[PDB]
């Protein structure tokens, strides 16, 4: 058998109005008050605060009081739901398995479609951090544009021929892809061919610094070895432009995050790996993505 | 003499208020119609559509013309008018310089108060990259986004007795702060005593860790030397938590980056290095700053 995934959570046009409904509400509200819910939400029957309680049951919304404001927001798996409601309403998503991965900023889960074919999601998750010393819901804003930067590179990459998963969709903060199957390169053990293996990642640097872009972030957990050895990059969130001032630190940095890995797992050292000055500028993708 | 600095251009309360009504139009449009403008701006004299030529002719706004629309957007140097205008008003800022670094996306300017106090000025750049293989006004709430949470990181590490710089007020993408007199660890040649800078860094990405924060960029560009040898903190855009499930490859790395330039730059080497395993969390800065 295969990763064991669960069809979503049946979800009524009530359910879908009030959860977008504070969805809407969080443009100009931490909190988002039961009346500013219940107006834009505006049901046909108005048991919306009935709705509320069992979208809270459920964990989809929280209830929470400040001094002077009390109300709604969307949690984590609010979401995360509506993202995947809406993914599975255009048949890309019809069941989510366990987490088995992450990214610098994402967490990556298998998902299958109705007729059981498995892909990756990733979701975004930005805004963690909470700011007390001086608005917080840039969370929902922050992870929609990863979510949306990721399938544009990802798309655009995949086009020129770069080594990344095929991009299937995006909605919110989920991006759904093509399963590459296979081990990060941090878990494997033995290679019979490292040189081989080491010359495909030092050429993806060149050809993304050929393309006007660093990773920045180019490890053993962003690169996965498929069954013939050949790797697939499923991160890349914070990527330099070769243009930056620093651009030449950036990219020796993640040659030499590559050497030391091939170094301590396989005992491999080579002469083979680029300098900045080897640079010969191809494109325009740290300005533009088409 | 010290650097040349000049006072913020004259504008009227009435040239000001359109700046702003641009401003307030971009919450909801990428190119901001004449007449929302001058609806927004609701000037007693009605004479918007002279102001809004006088903007353009100051490079303030620019004017442009797709298929479905026709109007106007705030410039680079519009927004930095805003920001440093609303500064002048706080008395913090009288007269800007030139510029005279970079962050990893953040231009930094000497700037004056009215007294000839000089103090440093970084404006956060974000949103550069432009999406059309598929809203690109992200860049204004980017910008003012990495200008608060720098704000907000350098106050609670100040006093948290981090060697960073006092921060003194930020607006929008702006943000002052103490100029630091010295040189970026990248242009200096010779160090007296080299292990002590060393030393410094290192206790700098211990006492970082112990309250949460792993720095990211950790380099030679970010670190300045003041005249007693002492390194202040300039940058830290993309702090990663320790909290993070590869915490301790982030942490290696700003480690394996101090050496690498030691090595280059001194011919200094040492075992006085750490490891992930000596971090005794101690604060939750990655989680809440306050
Ligand atoms: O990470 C992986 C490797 C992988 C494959 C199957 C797994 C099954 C069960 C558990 C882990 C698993 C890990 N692929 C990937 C990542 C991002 C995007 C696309 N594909
Ligand atoms: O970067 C510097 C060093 C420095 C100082 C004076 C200079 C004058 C002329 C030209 C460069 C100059 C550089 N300080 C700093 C940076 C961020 C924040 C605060 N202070
Ligand atoms: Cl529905
Ligand atoms: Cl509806």
């Given at each position: ?70 109300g709604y ?41 109705e007729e ?173 993505v088409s």
């Amino acid at each position: 058998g295969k990763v064991n995934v669960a069809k979503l959570r049946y979800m009524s046009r009530d359910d879908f109005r009030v959860l977008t409904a504070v969805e809407m509400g969080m443009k100009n509200h931490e909190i988002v008050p039961g009346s500013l819910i219940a107006s834009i939400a505006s049901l046909k029957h108005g048991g919306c605060n009935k709705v509320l309680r069992e979208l809270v049951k459920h964990k989809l919304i929280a209830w929470e009081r400040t001094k002077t404001v009390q109300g709604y927001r969307l949690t984590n798996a609010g979401y995360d739901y509506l993202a995947l409601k809406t993914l599975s309403s255009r048949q890309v998503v019809e069941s989510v398995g366990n987490q088995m991965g992450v990214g610098k900023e994402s967490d990556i889960y298998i998902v299958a479609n109705e007729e059981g074919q498995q892909f990756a999601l990733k979701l975004h998750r930005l805004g963690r951090t909470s700011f007390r010393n001086l608005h917080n819901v840039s969370w929902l804003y922050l992870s929609r544009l990863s979510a949306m930067k990721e399938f544009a590179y990802m798309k655009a990459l995949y086009e020129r021929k770069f080594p990344v998963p095929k991009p299937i969709d995006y909605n919110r903060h989920a991006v759904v892809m093509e399963l590459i199957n296979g081990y990060p390169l941090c878990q494997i053990h033995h290679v019979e061919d490292p040189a081989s293996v080491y010359d495909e990642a030092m050429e993806l640097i060149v050809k993304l610094a050929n393309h006007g872009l660093i990773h920045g972030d180019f490890n053993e957990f962003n690169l996965i070895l498929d069954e013939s050895d050949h790797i697939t990059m499923i991160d890349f969130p914070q990527m330099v432009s070769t243009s930056h001032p620093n651009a030449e630190w950036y990219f020796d940095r993640d040659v030499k995050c590559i050497k030391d890995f091939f170094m301590k797992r396989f005992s491999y050292e080579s002469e083979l790996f680029p300098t900045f000055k080897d640079i010969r500028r191809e494109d325009t993708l740290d300005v533009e993505v088409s």
